[PDB]
Ligand binder design. Structure first.
Ligand code: H20
Lengths: 517, 401
């Protein structure tokens, strides 16, 4: 059998001493039948008065179910499952792939002797004056905290050898399923599977028969898995007349999911439908542009597009492009415009930013994503020019670095619509702002701002100046805030005011912004 | 015989998440760990160990060999204190740094602590569980290792110490600082004497290219004022701004006279001649800045903070203080790429913190975490890892350095 994993209850705590609810004699009779078999089979064992512990049991033909919540609350923490699943594009194509349903594996695995006593439960006797039978587990209880972790572990040890013996085959454990892939010839593959099924049996691990096995495609959590290709499960868009905040929220959701394979999906217009919504059942009438987006996406979706698998041999190329303000689309491929995966990036980091900065972040996301899926960073092809980048680069307070990238003249190209002068301008008028301004040339304008906030006034001032000043201007301000904001040269912002300024800024020939206490 | 070590009272073991690694690094890590296994230094562990510390593979300077780097930062923090620094060492002419991490590999770790040293070699795209281990011997990078090995270490050193008393030898985590003032040629030769004298006992590479630090030459970068021919309204304004700022440190700074040249909404470019009054006020301001503020002493019981500003063109600026504006040291650093440079700087500044105070500073990095976590290991070479947090360098502070 397999080596036991030593378990202990959480520090300072004691075993579950929980009372067994009343059980209908019809259920009592069913359990006993069930528990006898389990005992005949070794899974559990009758125990004595010794054991003060107990964990509730109830009936659900009849089925047995023990409530281990309490024991679980009292059981130590384990290095749990994995919480992280592989993404289709990370896989390499395989000729044949068969999944085995490791039947009741927790039951086929021993349980730390010293812990067995804490798994004690009680099958009440039918008649009043007589005692009820007491048992405890000798294996991994169903529904118990350590069962998956411990089951998965052992499984791996069990697989380890056969794995090294058969390098030509990879195996993926997922709870009870076990996936086996290889590039073996149908016959050969199928046999190695049986070669495997046996090795498992050598440990009482019983799997389903070939006649009853599962073969591709695989509708594995949002996906559809073919041997040579992959995709997202078919996504059907409703054709309602009346859309509820809820229906819309779901649409947008399903739409995002598509994004990783279907390029050009767009949700802006739809997302907009959510503004001011007062209830999850509230109906919202679609805007002309939402209906368009719905129809546009509807189309892109009517097309079944698939993804390819990872070819370790070939390089990874990531190509990014601007789909809208704040919107970036990218697609990673190895072979010429033959995607393994694609995706969007809307992440606006900070109230204000510029395409250069935003594009650079899109690169870091993709980078992190790739390292996680293919263990390597892709060569990027971006719509920005080295000099453009390099320029913004060196002049930004924050440090930053982009992998290996190549310029790709594929409009639009990200640029800087403006650059503050490094030196004050000679011949350009000079404004001293604070809500108003005063220039070296005698001019001035005060304005009464209603509702504004301290900082919002500072930008107004500036905005005013830009407005009234000629093509070339020098501006002095005491606001550190506004200064930072503008020095950082944004080209888009959530604040309308700021966007106005930016407009001003783009139009000017020369602008010098200076700060003074 | 293993010294029973314990975690600070009530504290549990670390459960730090493991940052994604590149296949390359994973491969390196597998080769290494597998060998440490055969040699019984580590052992695979089971699901009953919920703890985890992040690992990394870094690169050796002048070597094709990788080096496993475990971020026991959290662990060392939850690790009981153990119950010194040679001010003289910072004064030596040359300090060389050695990696004596392998010393520990020959000293068992208290069986009960071992579960806390748990770490994991992750797998690409989660296709496999992820290889788990824990240490049996003293793990490199653990705050406990130097301590426990202290005794045995002092033994090994006492002969050389008495033999070459003109040499100062400091140990810090996995590093050994060897200082002296001998001619460079001699320094390098007496080091090698030690190396083999270390071999003589048991398994020492040259950290930092096997090159020397020259602490003697380390110096504070005072604040500076633009000295120019003609002075425009702008020049002065910036000038006054900066002065005003520096005033909070050196309160002896006066601006009265300079600010007087700034009355009336003039034009940024209009050239202003300096009245003698102001001319002399500047001068005094200048002399006041010629040196660091008096009364700034190092407090061993406070955290040593280090901030860095990107100056561009490969130029960076830093400052080491414990209390705002009370800098204990300030420096510059010039080249690569933003990140590579930045890491090299961190390390430069760390090494110094040690050499000078014997403690690593807590950095404040002008960078986006995702990024740092991504490339930092590409250029890192130290055996230790400082504490660090990420920030947004104000526009002005940079202008003032
Ligand atoms: C991890 C491994 C067994 C693997 C596959 O199994 C997968 C593992 C994730 C669960 C669903 C099936 C896989 C499946 C198909 Cl359909 C095509 C290519 C594949 N290439 C592979 O390397």
């Amino acid at each position: 059998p397999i080596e036991t994993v030593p378990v202990k209850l959480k520090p300072g705590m004691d075993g579950p001493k929980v009372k067994q609810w009343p059980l209908t004699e019809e259920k009592i009779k069913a359990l006993v039948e069930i528990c006898t078999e389990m005992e005949k089979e070794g899974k559990i064992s009758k125990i004595g008065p010794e054991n003060p512990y107990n964990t509730p049991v109830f009936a659900i033909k009849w089925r047995k179910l023990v409530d281990f919540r309490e024991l679980n609350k009292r059981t130590q923490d384990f290095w749990e499952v994995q919480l992280g699943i592989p993404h289709p594009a990370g896989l390499k194509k395989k000729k044949s792939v068969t999944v085995l349903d490791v039947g009741d594996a927790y039951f086929s695995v021993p349980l730390d002797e010293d812990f067995r006593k804490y798994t004690a439960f009680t099958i009440p006797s039918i008649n009043n004056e007589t005692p009820g039978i007491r048992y405890q587990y000798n294996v991994l209880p169903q529904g118990w905290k350590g069962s998956p972790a411990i089951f998965q572990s052992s499984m791996t040890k069990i697989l380890e050898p056969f794995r090294k013996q058969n390098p030509d085959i990879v195996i993926y454990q997922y709870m009870d399923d076990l996936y086996v892939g290889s590039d073996l010839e149908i016959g050969q593959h199928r046999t190695k599977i049986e070669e495997l099924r046996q090795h498992l049996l050598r440990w009482g691990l019983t799997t389903p028969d070939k006649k009853h096995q599962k073969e591709p495609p695989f509708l594995w959590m949002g996906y559809e898995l073919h041997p040579d290709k992959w995709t997202v499960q078919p996504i059907v868009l409703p054709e309602k007349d009346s859309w509820t905040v809820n229906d819309i929220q779901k649409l947008v959701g399903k739409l995002n999911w598509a994004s990783q394979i279907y390029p050009g999906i767009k949700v802006r217009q739809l997302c907009k439908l959510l503004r001011g919504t007062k209830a999850l059942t509230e109906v919202i009438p679609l805007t002309e542009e939402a209906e368009l987006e719905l129809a546009e996406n509807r189309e892109i979706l009517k097309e079944p597009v698939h993804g390819v698998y990872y070819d370790p041999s070939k390089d990874l190329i990531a190509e990014i492009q601007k789909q809208g303000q704040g919107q970036w689309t990218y697609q990673i491929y190895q072979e010429p415009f033959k995607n393994l995966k694609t995706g969007k990036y809307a992440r606006m980091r900070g109230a204000h930013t510029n395409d250069v900065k935003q594009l650079t972040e899109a690169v870091q996301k993709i980078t992190t994503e790739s390292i996680v899926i293919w263990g390597k960073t892709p060569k990027f092809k971006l719509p920005i020019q080295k000099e453009t980048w390099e320029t913004w680069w060196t002049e930004y307070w924050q440090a930053t670095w982009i992998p290996e990238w190549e310029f790709v003249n594929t409009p639009p190209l990200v640029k800087l619509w403006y650059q503050l002068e490094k030196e004050p301008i000679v011949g350009a008028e000079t404004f001293y702002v604070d809500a108003g301004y005063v220039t070296n040339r005698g001019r001035q304008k005060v304005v009464t701002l209603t509702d504004t906030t301290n900082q919002k006034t500072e930008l107004q001032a500036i905005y005013l100046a830009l407005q009234d000043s000629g093509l070339e201007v020098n501006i002095v301000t005491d606001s550190q805030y506004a200064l930072g904001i503008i020095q950082a040269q944004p080209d888009q912002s959530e604040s309308e005011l700021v966007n106005q300024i930016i407009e001003q800024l783009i139009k000017k020939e020369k602008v010098y912004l200076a700060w003074v206490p | 015989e293993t010294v029973p070590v314990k975690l600070k009272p009530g504290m549990d073991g670390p459960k730090v998440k493991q940052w994604p690694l590149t296949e390359e690094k994973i491969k390196a890590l597998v080769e290494i760990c597998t060998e440490m296994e055969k040699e019984g230094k580590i052992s695979k562990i089971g699901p009953e160990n919920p703890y985890n510390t992040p690992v990394f593979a870094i690169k050796k300077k002048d070597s094709t060999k990788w080096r496993k780097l475990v971020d026991f930062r959290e662990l060392n923090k939850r690790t009981q204190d153990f119950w010194p620094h040679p001010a003289g060492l910072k004064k030596k002419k040359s300090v060389t740094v050695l990696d004596v991490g392998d010393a520990y590999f020959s000293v068992p770790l208290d069986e009960d602590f071992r579960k806390y040293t748990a770490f994991t070699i992750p797998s690409i795209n989660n296709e496999t569980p992820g290889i788990r281990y824990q240490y049996n011997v003293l793990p490199q990078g653990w705050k406990g290792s130097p301590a426990i090995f202290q005794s045995s270490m002092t033994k090994i050193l006492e002969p050389f110490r008495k033999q070459n008393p003109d040499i100062v030898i400091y140990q810090y985590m996995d590093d050994l600082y060897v200082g002296s003032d001998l001619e460079i040629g001699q320094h390098r030769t007496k080091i090698e004497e030690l190396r083999q004298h270390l071999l003589r006992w048991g398994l020492p590479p040259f950290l930092w290219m096997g090159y020397e630090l020259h602490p003697d030459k380390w110096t504070v970068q005072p604040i500076v004022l633009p000295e120019k021919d003609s002075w425009t309204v702008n020049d002065i304004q910036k000038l006054v701004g900066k002065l005003n700022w520096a005033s909070q440190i050196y309160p002896g700074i006066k601006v009265r006279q300079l600010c007087k040249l700034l009355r009336g909404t003039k034009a940024l470019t209009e050239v202003i001649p300096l009245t003698e009054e102001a001319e002399l006020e500047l001068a005094e301001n200048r002399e006041i800045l010629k040196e660091p503020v008096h009364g700034v002493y190092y407090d061993p019981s406070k955290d040593l903070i280090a901030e860095i500003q990107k100056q561009g063109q490969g130029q960076w600026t830093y400052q080491i203080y414990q209390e705002p504006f009370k800098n204990l040291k300030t420096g510059k650093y010039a080249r690569t790429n933003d990140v590579k440079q930045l890491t090299e700087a961190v390390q430069k500044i760390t090494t110094e913190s040690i050499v000078i105070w014997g403690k690593t500073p807590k950095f404040k990095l002008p960078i986006q975490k995702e990024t740092w976590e991504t490339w930092w290991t590409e250029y890192w070479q130290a055996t230790w890892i400082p504490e660090w947090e990420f920030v947004n360098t104000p526009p002005l502070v940079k202008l003032w350095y």
